[PDB]
Amino acid sequence: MNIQNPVLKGFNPDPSIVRAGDDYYIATSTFEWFPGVQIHHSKDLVHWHLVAHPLSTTEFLDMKGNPDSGGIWAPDLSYADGKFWLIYTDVKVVDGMWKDCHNYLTTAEDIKGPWSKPILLNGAGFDASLFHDPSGKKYLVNMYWDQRVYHHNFYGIALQEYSVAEEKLIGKPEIIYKGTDIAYTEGPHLYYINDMYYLMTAEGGTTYQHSETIARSKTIHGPYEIQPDYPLLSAWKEVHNPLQKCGHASLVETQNGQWYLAHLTGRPLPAPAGFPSREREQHAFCPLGRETAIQKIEWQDGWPVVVGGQQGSLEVEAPDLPQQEWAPTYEERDDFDKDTLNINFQTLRIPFSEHLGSLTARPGFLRLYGRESLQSKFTQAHIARRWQSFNFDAGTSVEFSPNSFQQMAGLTCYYNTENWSSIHVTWNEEKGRIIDLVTADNGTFSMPLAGAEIPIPDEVKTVHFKVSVRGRIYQYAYSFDGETFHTLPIELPSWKLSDDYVRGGGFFTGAFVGINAIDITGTALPADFDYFTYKEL
């Protein structure tokens, strides 16, 4: 099998690929979703499986209150001196003149941990990356933020030596590279190749204008000469290319000296028929967020070249390595008969804990305790998993006995705290327990079934919910028996749960489907979920 892009589907941006012996890993950014930094593994670049999230406690990552699309930005995973080194960034401010953040280092002998107590490095910019010089010294590169309002904020790439002995950057920031005219110069990575230093950067911003370029210097301090044919990677000029937004790359060499380039990409939904093809920014919506692809690299005259052209291809020649497939990391129907929440589920900002729910209180069920609303950046009893196809069915069943409109529990399709939809069991003064629907659309909240809420008979303990996502549209359905489903008479827009639709400075995640319980009263009412199903068509 050749590489079939994207190799990491759905929300999986800013890939940092590393080879450790015969093992390959990719770290991707997770933003407000917890635990932080997804790590996938492969031995062939073709077959991947989700294996770890190093940022697993509040001592690594304390995100309560973080803005949507704050938290963990691009991570940097390397391997040297018998361990993995992970640089991660917690971003606290995502819009306006500043981008307040903090870069940390944690290390581990095994990808699954334990990871060391974080060392706080700096905050001069995001996209910090650690480089292991052949000398044995260590260097951090990061972008350097210029807040001054008359300037572009991306002032270039700073370099500083990291002292392992002192556990701190020494000296002071040195700007080694300013980028090209395309600007938004970020995602720096250094490589020592051909007895030279190569500095690779993302440029243009993570939109349709995204790109990657490389430059080289005899010494680490520069000046760096920019590759003549820049960019290395960009789909900006090819509006019909299956992979869009191609940038934020990392380079890997295989054990036999072949070269590959991991990068992020978006795959927009088709626009309506006849709409102008150059208007991606108006009509091209990516509900699967930014995904990870891998391109093949060839070298010419000491410069790398993306095989098949700079735009990036779907099908890429696999490396000459024995192939190894992986067991699935989830089941189409998760019956919640294990004590460990599946690795494909995340919570918002904070750890899953007994405060939010339990797999042991009622074995064979996930019990969620109703907590704060869908709007809250603090304590949501809400678990979710990524949309990873444009066409899937997902569903659940819930037992819930609300006594007020203050309590609701059900199925969610969720992007951020003001972009979501929810079908749920709640309560009405005249109908008692009811099924209702609420939507949030860039902060406009709607209740389209108002006055047509579905009464739930007292004899119906368990209500089943279903979402059917079919490209641009999705619909919700419910059942009182598990066999016959009734679709709510509304077509919801999948394209609104996308990086390209949501407002604000931070648009960096992707659509999720999940289950939640809300109890504003404070009574922690329990919602018991028998299963969670996710089936791609």
Active-site amino acid positions: 14, 186
b/e 459-474 (16+ beta carbons within 10 angstroms → b): eeebbbbbbbbeebeb
Nearest distance from residue 377's CB to a copy of itself, in Å?
A: 6
Nearest distance from residue 532's CB to a copy of itself, in Å?
A: 25
Residues that bind a copy of itself (CB under 8 A): 64-66, 92-93, 95-98, 100, 102-103, 120-124, 145-152, 172-173, 181-184, 204-205, 209, 236-237, 239-240, 272, 274-279, 372-379, 403-406, 418, 438, 440, 443, 445-447, 450, 520-523
* Nearer of residues 361 and 447 to a copy of itself, judged by Cβ: 447
Amino acid letter, 414: Y
Nearest distance from residue 273's CB to a copy of itself, in Å?
A: 8
* Nearer of residues 238 and 536 to a copy of itself, judged by Cβ: 238
Nearest distance from residue 450's CB to a copy of itself, in Å?
A: 5
* Nearer of residues 65 and 364 to a copy of itself, judged by Cβ: 65
Determine contact, residues 466/484, Cβ cutoff 8 Å: no
Three-class DSSP labels, 399-465: ECCCCCCCEEEEEEEEEECCEEEEEEEEEECCCEEEEEEEEEECCEEECCCCCCCEECCCCCCEEEE
Neighbours of 131 (CB within 10 A): 22
b/e 262-300 (16+ beta carbons within 10 angstroms → b): bbbbbbbbebeeeeeeeebeebbbbbbbbbbbbbbbeee
* Nearer of residues 255 and 403 to a copy of itself, judged by Cβ: 403
Q: Give the Cα separation of 124 and 140 in Å (integer).
A: 11
* Nearer of residues 71 and 319 to a copy of itself, judged by Cβ: 71
Nearest distance from residue 455's CB to a copy of itself, in Å?
A: 16
Find the DSSP H helices in 131-236. Answer: none
Nearest distance from residue 445's CB to a copy of itself, in Å?
A: 4
Amino acid letter, 496: K
Exposed / middle / buried, residue 458 (Cβ in 10 Å: 0-12, 13-18, 19+): exposed
Cα 534 from chain centroid (whole Å):
18
Q: Give the Cα separation of 288 and 6 in Å (integer).
A: 11
* Nearer of residues 128 and 297 to a copy of itself, judged by Cβ: 128
**Which 8-state DSSP code applies to residue 97?**
S
Amino acid letter, 39: I
